[PDB]
Design a protein around this ligand. Structure first.
Ligand SMILES: [Zn+2]
Ligand SMILES: [Zn+2]
Lengths: 171, 138, 64
């Protein structure tokens, strides 16, 4: 799901970045680290709304090294998967255990055992495709996958989907 | 019965019977909670109720106060066909003869459905349901 | 005759099959019950009973 949440991050700056323009640098860092990365607590961070009204609060000096620590509160658009969530995706890589569906920035995997019996694996084709009794699952094909479980590891999120139930499969 | 309510859980009276016993309308078979939940949770497959082969679907269950499968099927089909026929040419003017004749036709259709005959007249009754639905849409 | 007298018609205690088997001469009713699978016996010995008054409370919570 594509949600919007106010996140807070502690930014560390080197003593060489204490110019009057340092605020800009903050925002710069606040982009370079937050946009594109991922967190196991809020999901894949997509974008960061409100770039002009970014609160800076007050910077504190930690003991050694002399680097500066900041607490920034902002608003960001993030993407977080959920268990048992119907999503759509396109296949990228194919495997004998199942094809790897691509849903946004997340690469969900579908186990072969979590597939109907009529859906069979075909390696003789290029690329290897899953041929069923009516639908042919190829790379560029669009498949509606129902996510059964999700894993929220730090800076790394992988989920498992299935298409065995009704109203699923290729789009 | 107190001796058959699930092929795996047929005697749960001394195990504190706190689980219900659902029945699928496409099987008419009693299955306890912990079993059917795994059944439709692992995929729409058939229940092993005395070697049953009819597929049990996900959800679409019902609570049963037990009035025999014959009367339960006759009241389910009775209500469904009663909703398909609706009130077409019933209280349109106040006639009693043609109204009772049409009710006799509807009840004869429900009778042919609960008896099945030879799987030939019931299909014509299904086409009659599609025709009546087409008349209700217009 | 002891082997032919099935189910507590003639009981004994098989000790060793090399010393004429020191026997035993008592009677009850069934005594066989070898239809009880060995797996059920292994699952019966692995159950650790809650001592003291914990067992009646654990049985009154289940409804027995
Ligand atoms: Zn059961
Ligand atoms: Zn059944």
């Amino acid at each position: 799901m594509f949600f919007i949440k106010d996140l807070s991050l502690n930014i560390t700056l080197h003593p060489s970045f204490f110019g009057p323009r340092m605020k800009q640098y903050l925002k710069t860092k606040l982009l370079e680290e937050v946009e594109g990365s991922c967190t196991g607590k809020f999901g894949y961070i997509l974008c960061v709304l409100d770039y002009d009204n970014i609160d800076i609060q007050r910077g504190r000096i930690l003991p050694t090294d002399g680097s500066a620590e900041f607490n920034v509160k902002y608003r960001a658009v993030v993407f977080k998967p959920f268990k048992g969530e119907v999503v759509d995706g396109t296949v990228v890589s194919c495997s004998q255990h199942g094809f790897e569906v691509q849903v946004g920035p997340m690469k969900v995997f579908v186990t072969k055992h979590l597939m109907p019996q009529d859906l069979t694996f075909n390696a003789g084709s290029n690329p290897p495709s899953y041929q069923s009794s009516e639908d042919v699952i190829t790379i560029k094909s669009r498949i509606r996958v129902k996510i059964e479980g999700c894993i929220s590891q730090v800076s790394s999120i992988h989920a498992i989907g299935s298409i065995k139930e009704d109203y699923l499969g290729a789009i | 019965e107190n001796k058959d309510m699930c092929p795996i859980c047929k005697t749960d009276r001394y195990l504190s019977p706190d689980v219900k016993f659902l029945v699928n309308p496409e099987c008419y078979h009693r299955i306890c909670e912990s079993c059917v939940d795994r059944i439709f949770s692992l995929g729409p497959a058939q229940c092993p109720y005395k070697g049953c082969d009819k597929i049990l679907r996900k959800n679409k269950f019902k609570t049963q106060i037990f009035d025999d499968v014959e009367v339960e099927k006759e009241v389910d089909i009775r209500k469904r066909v009663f909703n398909v026929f609706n009130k077409t040419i019933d209280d349109f003017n106040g006639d009693l003869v043609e109204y009772n004749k049409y009710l006799e036709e509807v009840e004869d259709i429900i009778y042919k459905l609960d008896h099945g005959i030879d799987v030939a007249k019931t299909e014509e009754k299904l086409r009659t349901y599609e025709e009546l639905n087409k008349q209700l849409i217009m | 005759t002891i082997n032919q007298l099935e189910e507590d018609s003639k009981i004994l205690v098989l000790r060793t099959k090399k010393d004429k088997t020191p026997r035993y001469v008592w009677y009850n009713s069934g005594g066989n019950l070898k239809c009880i699978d060995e797996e059920f016996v292994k699952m019966w010995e692995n159950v650790q009973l809650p001592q003291f008054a914990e067992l009646p409370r654990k049985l009154q919570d289940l409804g027995l």
